[PDB]
């Protein structure tokens, strides 16, 4: 069962974060209401001294306030935050942070970003090759609606297939066809139509000498 999602962050390790489209108007409503409260009771720069593991608000590059978690307190000027509804990370001074009211906690609305990885693909070990694959996915799917299916679990996050929402084309397969990633083979019957296939796409890419396959 493919589920509609909005892709918000692609990581340098070729993982990505998504929001569930079904809960998106609720996120927008919570953000509306949270920022209403912030405009009425403006955070004083430096009045919040953060601690590791706390939820807070943080002012992003667009000048808007978002929900965040404090991951590391390096110094008062260098607080490492994770934007819990989007999945991106940032180092900020405490002057761009404020307290998160209980009205807007993760108990009122859970963190909206969930981490996933592509099923049936190996993340390239070479940094430059990995960068090419990451850059391609960012251009392909960042800030777009996709359809997601969970394929299997892993030692880390779940591994999934993604389809472009309009065209229904398989995102991960497109990376394989472009020679940006290698196939990670799965044996299971339920995966056979998809895998043997991904392996035939890897052949298209090996023949066109694309990206990973440029030199044989």
């Amino acid at each position: 069962s493919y589920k509609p999602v909005f892709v918000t962050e692609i990581t340098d390790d070729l993982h990505f974060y998504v929001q569930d489209v079904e809960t998106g108007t609720q996120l927008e409503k919570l953000m509306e209401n949270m920022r209403n409260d912030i405009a009425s009771h403006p955070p004083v720069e430096g009045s919040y001294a953060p601690r590791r593991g706390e939820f807070c608000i943080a002012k992003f590059v667009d000048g808007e306030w978002y929900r965040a978690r404090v991951e590391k307190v390096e110094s008062p000027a260098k607080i490492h935050v994770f934007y819990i509804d989007y999945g991106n990370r940032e180092v900020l001074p405490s002057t761009r942070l404020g307290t998160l009211s209980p009205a807007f906690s993760t108990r009122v609305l859970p963190a909206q970003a969930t981490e996933y990885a592509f099923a049936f693909i190996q993340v390239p070990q070479d940094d430059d090759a990995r960068t090419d694959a990451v850059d391609s996915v960012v251009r392909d799917i960042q800030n777009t609606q996709c359809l997601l299916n969970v394929e299997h679990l892993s030692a880390g996050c779940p591994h999934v297939t993604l389809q472009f929402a309009d065209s229904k084309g398989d995102v991960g397969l497109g990376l394989v066809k472009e020679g940006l990633v290698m196939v990670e083979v799965r044996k299971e019957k339920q995966f056979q139509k998809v895998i043997t296939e991904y392996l035939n796409a890897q052949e298209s890419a090996k023949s066109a000498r694309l990206n990973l396959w440029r030199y044989g």
Partner: peptide, 4 residues
């Protein structure tokens, strides 16, 4: 949708 961005943000920027």
């Amino acid at each position: 949708r961005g943000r920027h």
